[PDB]
Design a protein around this nucleic acid. Structure first.
Ligand code: K
Ligand code: K
Ligand code: MG
Ligand code: MG
Length: 135
RNA sequence: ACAU
DNA sequence: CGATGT
């Protein structure tokens, strides 16, 4: 603790894993939805969590905001730190879209800078992250 | 085991 | 119960 309330919180929602993947970002304090990604027909939970963080980085940079990002995903936080999404999802025609988005997110990380702190939301202490889908 |  | 990840 404590929660940094001046922050952006992201989370993934899916129908199956692998399955339909979406994500959203919210104001941690107010719950206002700041962005939502159109559902992607096939992806994994961790790919979605990764895309959500990267989108948050791009969203905050475009707005000249120094707020941190919260995610509850140990995996996605590490993938962003590494600039490399180490997903096991097969590459085929069905997964082409999510893989294109992941490749492009990595490419963005490798061509841009940011100071945005990427923080672990401590679900065991604080309850569900504010961007949670409730599924 | 931990995080989803 | 299954799956994605470190
Ligand atoms: K949920
Ligand atoms: K496991
Ligand atoms: Mg999550
Ligand atoms: Mg959730």
């Amino acid at each position: 603790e404590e929660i940094i309330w001046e922050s952006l919180s992201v989370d993934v929602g899916s129908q199956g894993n692998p399955g339909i993947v979406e994500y959203k970002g919210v104001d941690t304090k107010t719950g206002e939805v700041l962005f939502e990604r159109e559902p992607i027909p096939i992806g994994t939970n961790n790919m979605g969590e990764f895309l959500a963080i990267v989108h948050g980085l791009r969203y905050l940079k475009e707005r000249n905001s120094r707020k941190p990002i919260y995610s509850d995903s140990q995996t996605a936080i590490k993938w962003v730190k590494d600039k490399k999404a180490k997903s096991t999802l097969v590459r085929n025609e069905e997964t082409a879209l999510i893989w294109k988005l992941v490749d492009e997110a990595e490419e963005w990380l490798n061509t841009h800078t940011y100071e945005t702190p990427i923080l672990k939301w401590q679900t065991d202490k604080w309850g569900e992250i504010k961007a949670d889908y409730g599924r």
